[PDB]
Amino acid sequence: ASRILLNNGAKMPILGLGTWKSPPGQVTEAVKVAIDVGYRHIDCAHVYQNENEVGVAIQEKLREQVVKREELFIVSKLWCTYHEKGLVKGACQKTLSDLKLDYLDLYLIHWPTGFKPGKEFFPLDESGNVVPSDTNILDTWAAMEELVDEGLVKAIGISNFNHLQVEMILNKPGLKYKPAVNQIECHPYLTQEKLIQYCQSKGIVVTAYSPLGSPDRPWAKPEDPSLLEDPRIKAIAAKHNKTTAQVLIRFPMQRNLVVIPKSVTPERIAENFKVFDFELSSQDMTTLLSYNRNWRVCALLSCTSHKDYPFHEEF
Ligand SMILES: NC(=O)c1ccc[n+]([C@@H]2O[C@H](COP(=O)([O-])OP(=O)(O)OC[C@H]3O[C@@H](n4cnc5c(N)ncnc54)[C@H](OP(=O)(O)O)[C@@H]3O)[C@@H](O)[C@H]2O)c1
């Protein structure tokens, strides 16, 4: 099955296309090809600075009569500098304007950490620490709720929230909408067993980001573990006559996760979608889960003293 049921009654495609670090000079073509070969879910964000070019691609394939709006599942995220209640709607509407859409299927709080409002995406003080804002998770959530009630977004969710931060929203007095989704980093080196259990036990769908280990992440170091180059995973891939990337995308699908691999290379965009014709064995799944090392692609040292930094908690 290609889609999973959210708590708002809508169905979310379990395979989507990532767009972080897809350059605007290349992302329009990426999205066009993705839609041609079957993708219906695109993961976006204002901070990725390419939503206009994503929107160009979508508008065109709508104009070519390739897909209908209703068939697409478009996700975007509220950036950290817009957590103030007064700023949330304008942030969403800028995303809608850039994407040339009149609604989003899902809008996420990108990180639990609010940052000082201003033009800079990562405002730092003279010593490198992020400058926080005096915002909290619950008031930001309340502002997200308003986006649903105004018809700008069909579903709201969170990203990079630890289980206590999710619990805060769940237990919120006067809660109007539960989060539909928690989008978190998840791959064989960061398997997230406890947070997935927690989220699934609350009827929150989990989306796995950086499923290939984000080899293009800008702070990569040579010493770092490399999933796509891991000979153990290559050996499971060769057993199935599939690529390592295909095994890494199939793995979260078999854990009832959504997964959003990124590529701007047309060959790979097509490759990565061809994951519905094979199954990883029980042994393969156990093997892959065994590779956990609690290794994160996305954790900025610059935010570790923020009151809402998510990764001090075990999960
Ligand atoms: N919520 C958040 O905080 C958050 C954080 C990180 C990521 N995300 C979302 O998750 C998406 C996926 O994560 P990611 O972008 O970090 O990394 P990823 O999907 O794990 O890895 C992307 C990298 O893998 C390469 N690649 C793709 N398919 C390949 C294949 N078949 N064989 C070999 N290499 C391949 C890509 O290269 P080319 O593109 O050059 O082909 C790119 O360098 C992001 O784009 C974003 O949408 C969300």
Ligand SMILES: O=C(O)CCc1ccc(-c2cccc([N+](=O)[O-])c2)s1
């Ligand atoms: O933006 C993306 O989706 C991928 C790019 C990023 C990587 C780390 C990011 C981050 C932002 C705020 C706070 C923290 N934190 O508390 O660790 C991390 S953003």
